[PDB]
Ligand binder design. Structure first.
Ligand code: HEC
Ligand code: HEC
Lengths: 129, 129
């Protein structure tokens, strides 16, 4: 896994960040623990269109195709059109009541899961999402 | 439990229906199995304002203060302002994927749970919601 594949847009301004492989291993864990229930393989079980594929992410509002945007999303989940807050029903830090796995999640983890999500299509191609 | 307390508005047109106590016992079961996780005591764990109290229900869009409206809600969940469908994240029949307890739910059950929900404030007063 070259440093190239591990280079992702950290924000929407185009800035790049190189994540360590270790962080990605941790992102996967958090992901497999708190997201795989409805997102295994980068899909969205109950909403096929709003996937974890680059295309879907890029077309979200705002685009969720960069680490910052993905981190924001977990901290403050919103519908695809991004105008209705769904933190009450979607896993988030203010939703840890009905989502036990969100009680010990830290920014570092959010950062890692974000890198993990963005990594998958680079390595699994269209198998992801 | 007189037949009076068991008289509820079946629809928004003001029609009344008298449910049997037996049906209410069954509604409670379905409720305790599929709703108590976020609605025990008629509350909404992750959204305090959108409760199961008569006032909140009556102020929903459309009002969810009659059996038909409540049944519709479970079949097709929508935000409080009733304009965003949240069946993908809220228990419903098209949401039974992530909500196992919704796989064997029948209209009869929906009808019973609806009666149960509407019964609680009549017997628990403000303790409910
Ligand atoms: C089921 C209970 C879910 C779990 C567990 C997680 N997510 Fe989810 N997510 C879910 C739905 C039904 C939706 C669509 C909401 C809508 O109406 O738009 C989503 C969406 C996302 C997205 C946005 C996808 C996109 O814009 O294309 C992301 C970034 C996302 N979810 C990430 C994510 C993560 C990291 C999770 C774990 C912390 C997670 N989700 C859990 C349903 C569910
Ligand atoms: C995982 C959590 C969860 C479960 C389980 C759940 N609900 Fe909800 N429910 C919510 C949330 C959160 C809302 C608020 C949605 C909104 O308006 O944004 C809600 C709202 C509702 C409302 C509308 C309340 C109002 O005042 O308008 C009703 C009716 C309702 N749920 C009934 C049920 C019933 C019946 C079940 C079971 C079949 C159920 N819910 C299971 C989380 C849950």
């Amino acid at each position: 896994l070259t440093e190239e594949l591990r280079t992702f847009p950290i924000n929407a301004q185009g800035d790049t960040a190189v994540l360590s492989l270790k962080e990605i291993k941790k992102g996967q864990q958090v992901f497999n623990a708190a997201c795989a229930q409805c997102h295994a393989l980068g899909v969205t079980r109950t909403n096929p269109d709003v996937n974890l594929s680059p295309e879907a992410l890029a077309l979200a509002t705002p685009p969720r195709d960069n680490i910052a945007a993905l981190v924001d999303y977990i901290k403050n989940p919103t519908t695809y059109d991004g105008f209705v807050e769904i933190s009450e029903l979607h896993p988030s830090l203010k939703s840890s009541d009905i989502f036990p796995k969100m009680r010990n999640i830290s920014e570092d983890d959010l950062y890692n899961v974000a890198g993990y999500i963005l990594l998958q299509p680079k390595v699994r191609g269209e198998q992801w999402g």
